[PDB]
Amino acid sequence: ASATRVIQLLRNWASGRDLQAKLQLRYQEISKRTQPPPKLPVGPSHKLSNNYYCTR
Amino acid sequence: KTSFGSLKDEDRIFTNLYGRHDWRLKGAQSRGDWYKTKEILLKGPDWILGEVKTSGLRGRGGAGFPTGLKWSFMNKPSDGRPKYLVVNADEGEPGTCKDREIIRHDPHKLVEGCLVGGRAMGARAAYIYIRGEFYNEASNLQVAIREAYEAGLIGKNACGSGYDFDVFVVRGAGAYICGEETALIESIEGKQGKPRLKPPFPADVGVFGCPTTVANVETVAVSPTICRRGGAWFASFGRERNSGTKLFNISGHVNHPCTVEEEMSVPLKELIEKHAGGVIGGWDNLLAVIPGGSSTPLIPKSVCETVLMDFDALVQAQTGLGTAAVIVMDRSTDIVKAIARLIEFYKHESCGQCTPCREGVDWMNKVMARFVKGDARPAEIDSLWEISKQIEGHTICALGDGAAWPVQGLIRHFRPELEERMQQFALQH
Numbered sequence A: 001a002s003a004t005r006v007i008q009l010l011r012n013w014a015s016g017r018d019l020q021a022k023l024q025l026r027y028q029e030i031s032k033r034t035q036p037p038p039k040l041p042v043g044p045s046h047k048l049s050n051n052y053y054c055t056r
Numbered sequence B: 001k002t003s004f005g006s007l008k009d010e011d012r013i014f015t016n017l018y019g020r021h022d023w024r025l026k027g028a029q030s031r032g033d034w035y036k037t038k039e040i041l042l043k044g045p046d047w048i049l050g051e052v053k054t055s056g057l058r059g060r061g062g063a064g065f066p067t068g069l070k071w072s073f074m075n076k077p078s079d080g081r082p083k084y085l086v087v088n089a090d091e092g093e094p095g096t097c098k099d100r101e102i103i104r105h106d107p108h109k110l111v112e113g114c115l116v117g118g119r120a121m122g123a124r125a126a127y128i129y130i131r132g133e134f135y136n137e138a139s140n141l142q143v144a145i146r147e148a149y150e151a152g153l154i155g156k157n158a159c160g161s162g163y164d165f166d167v168f169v170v171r172g173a174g175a176y177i178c179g180e181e182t183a184l185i186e187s188i189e190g191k192q193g194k195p196r197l198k199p200p201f202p203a204d205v206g207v208f209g210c211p212t213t214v215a216n217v218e219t220v221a222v223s224p225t226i227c228r229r230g231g232a233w234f235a236s237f238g239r240e241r242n243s244g245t246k247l248f249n250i251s252g253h254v255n256h257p258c259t260v261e262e263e264m265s266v267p268l269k270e271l272i273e274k275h276a277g278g279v280i281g282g283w284d285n286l287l288a289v290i291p292g293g294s295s296t297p298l299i300p301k302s303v304c305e306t307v308l309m310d311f312d313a314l315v316q317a318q319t320g321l322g323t324a325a326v327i328v329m330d331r332s333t334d335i336v337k338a339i340a341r342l343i344e345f346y347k348h349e350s351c352g353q354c355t356p357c358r359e360g361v362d363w364m365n366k367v368m369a370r371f372v373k374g375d376a377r378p379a380e381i382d383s384l385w386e387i388s389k390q391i392e393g394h395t396i397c398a399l400g401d402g403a404a405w406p407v408q409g410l411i412r413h414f415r416p417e418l419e420e421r422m423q424q425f426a427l428q429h
């Protein structure tokens, strides 16, 4: 956060905890908004043999 | 008897297989044909049927059904409709050329067989359905039938027995499916060569809606010799329930391809190495052999080493006797390519009526082409096996079974080659 050391110390004392560690606002730890393309797997019935529907 | 596979020339039914004698009436009579035919007909249908049953004769068409009971199916009181005998001379099974020799070089034997069979089944006439490509053979058969008519052997008062009988030759038009009995009946009736659905069986409703019996050329031509020389003599050759003398066509990679009338239950190795000079390059160069044409699954060299050429022995060997067309492939043969070509043949010779046949045969053809190219995956072999099993038993004709069986045999006996070729294709790309 863009908070000065005096303000950070006052905030931590008033709260009683280290707020600068577990900040609620998200800055950079979020995942990227442009993720690589995926490749999802097929299910257990995507086989060319021994897969008659009467058995499942 | 214990060991079979050595027939003496005195016992061979077809004594003019190679056309080294006259194929006309004089030659046939000199070779024993038409002897005491009047007495055979005057014996009665029951006597002829009993002789056929005692001979242990089984169908030479490929089904191997007991001939005696099949013919006796027609032995019923007349219901006001005529009865016919139909001779299956289509001979479309790849590797099968035995009926061609019978028609071309021993035609009077076939005519006498038609007469005897019609007397046994009380058939008014006989429609011989010869292959359309067999035009010279059809001409020879027509000449023989004309000679029989002139001599009084057939026609009104056939051989003086008081039995009226006609023999008709109907040429084919180029359909392998017309080899099927019901499809042949449909072709004779003038429709498309699409097999019927049983029941009704031909013995009740057949050609023109009349009781009928379809039979192979060899099965009909061996009947006069069975009646004359005796059922016991015919049964004396071959194993029990596999009795008789069988015509064999030995094609493929053999030194001397030919056709010989050996005894049933002859060892396959003895048949190949004696009458054909063995496999090209020796018996140690034999990859696989198709024993019964194309509809029968292949067998590897290990099976071919000790196997008898009869119905039961080949049935135990996960194959069939069929038309006894021994296709021989050496170890230089692309077995996958050969099986793919057979499946392509079945694709091009499919009536296209039943859904499993029409769709699945083409599907398997495409899959086999991709296997030949190697452009597939190892998981597709079991898929192809399942497709073949879905085709087999679920069709109208047995052409579905006849197209599934080669694939099943290939998958059963050479799966490592398929997987290896798939690996080769994968590595190259």
Ligand SMILES: Cc1cc2nc3c(=O)[nH]c(=O)nc-3n(C[C@H](O)[C@H](O)[C@H](O)COP(=O)(O)O)c2cc1C
Binding pocket: B058, B059, B060, B061, B062, B063, B064, B065, B067, B088, B089, B090, B091, B092, B093, B176, B177, B178, B179, B180, B181, B182, B214, B215, B216, B217, B219, B397, B398, B399, B402
């Ligand atoms: C696809 C197919 C092709 C056939 N081709 C022939 C053939 O060329 N010659 C033949 O005698 N039987 C052939 N058959 C068997 C016939 O349907 C019939 O069973 C046979 O002609 C009668 O044999 P049999 O009377 O000697 O027992 C074929 C069957 C099928 C399913």
